[PDB]
Scaffold this active site. Sequence first.
Site, PDB file in Angstrom:
ATOM      1  N   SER A 238     -37.565   9.100  65.323  1.00  0.00           N
ATOM      2  CA  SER A 238     -36.115   8.987  65.502  1.00  0.00           C
ATOM      3  C   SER A 238     -35.877   8.321  66.870  1.00  0.00           C
ATOM      4  O   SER A 238     -36.581   7.383  67.241  1.00  0.00           O
ATOM      5  CB  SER A 238     -35.447  10.368  65.204  1.00  0.00           C
ATOM      6  OG  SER A 238     -34.105  10.523  65.703  1.00  0.00           O
TER       7      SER A 238
ATOM      8  N   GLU B 267     -38.289   2.092  60.220  1.00  0.00           N
ATOM      9  CA  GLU B 267     -37.661   3.010  59.292  1.00  0.00           C
ATOM     10  C   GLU B 267     -36.235   3.219  59.757  1.00  0.00           C
ATOM     11  O   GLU B 267     -35.925   3.004  60.942  1.00  0.00           O
ATOM     12  CB  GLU B 267     -38.387   4.357  59.226  1.00  0.00           C
ATOM     13  CG  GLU B 267     -38.327   5.172  60.506  1.00  0.00           C
ATOM     14  CD  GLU B 267     -37.117   6.087  60.664  1.00  0.00           C
ATOM     15  OE1 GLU B 267     -36.731   6.355  61.832  1.00  0.00           O
ATOM     16  OE2 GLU B 267     -36.573   6.571  59.634  1.00  0.00           O
TER      17      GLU B 267
ATOM     18  N   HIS C 159     -37.268   9.347  57.818  1.00  0.00           N
ATOM     19  CA  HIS C 159     -36.354  10.478  57.797  1.00  0.00           C
ATOM     20  C   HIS C 159     -36.342  11.285  56.523  1.00  0.00           C
ATOM     21  O   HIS C 159     -35.587  12.256  56.441  1.00  0.00           O
ATOM     22  CB  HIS C 159     -34.949  10.002  58.144  1.00  0.00           C
ATOM     23  CG  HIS C 159     -34.731   9.797  59.601  1.00  0.00           C
ATOM     24  ND1 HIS C 159     -35.165   8.694  60.300  1.00  0.00           N
ATOM     25  CD2 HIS C 159     -34.107  10.599  60.488  1.00  0.00           C
ATOM     26  CE1 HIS C 159     -34.784   8.840  61.580  1.00  0.00           C
ATOM     27  NE2 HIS C 159     -34.148   9.977  61.712  1.00  0.00           N
TER      28      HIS C 159
END
Length: 306
Positions: free
Chosen positions: A113, A215, A283
């Site tokens: 993240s 991602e 995620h």
Amino acid sequence: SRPSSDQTWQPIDGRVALIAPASAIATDVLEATLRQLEVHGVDYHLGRHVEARYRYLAGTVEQRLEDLHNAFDMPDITAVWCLRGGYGCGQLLPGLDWGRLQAASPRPLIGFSDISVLLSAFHRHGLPAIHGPVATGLGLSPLSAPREQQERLASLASVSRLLAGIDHELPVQHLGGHKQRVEGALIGGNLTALACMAGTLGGLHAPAGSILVLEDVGEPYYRLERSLWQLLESIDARQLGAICLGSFTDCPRKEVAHSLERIFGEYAAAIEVPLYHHLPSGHGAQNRAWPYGKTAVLEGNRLRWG
Ligand SMILES: [K+]
Ligand code: NA
């Protein structure tokens, strides 16, 4: 592998420093996290400011720097596992004492993240790191689908397994460009987070030949494109070895005329960089750890590191 369903943790020697350099954490999730570390026999040190709150951030920059620096001051620490991503760790970069970090015995930094920003900065400074689950994944309410919960647990286990050196590869699929073997450093992570550092002292470290993993989560396609254009323009993109896509979760197409594969494929072709996808990283429940800044090879249907 497929990836593999295996979810037994390996022992973690030493002590794991737990820090919250980005978003604030909930107390119940934190406590559940700590109990699970104890279940697995993992000794930890909890950062003094991990429960701090400053709007959505886990305390002020100064509070978070105190904890990050302390994680490198303590002698017995063998890994630094970030508790949560979200937003904010790039804020620590202007004040970060790289000499203090480099003086400490090796202790890989772990997260994904927003933490992708620190992984990159660590790579730039020759410090080991892992792109993988954040530690509060241990304390989340279980996923309702048993199969997804099992995948979350396998993804959490992959951190200790990678620290121990027992896992060596992840599955991928070729998507565009040439099919020859590519060998280079693994870089990247969250597309949004990294684009949001371009033009700053925290811009992605992207040495020639690198394999850029991307991602994301929660984005309309135009925003993914906007981030990709910025990120690629901001680095020496034509010198990359490959782009390797992980998952794009909660990014519904909403009638956009081009698929995500088409959009990414167009950008990769324009810089003559081959494109892979289906890396089980991101995620979703599938978020397998990979060694950040370490050389790996893309060949057939695998990404493999030594
Ligand atoms: K996002
Ligand atoms: Na450029």
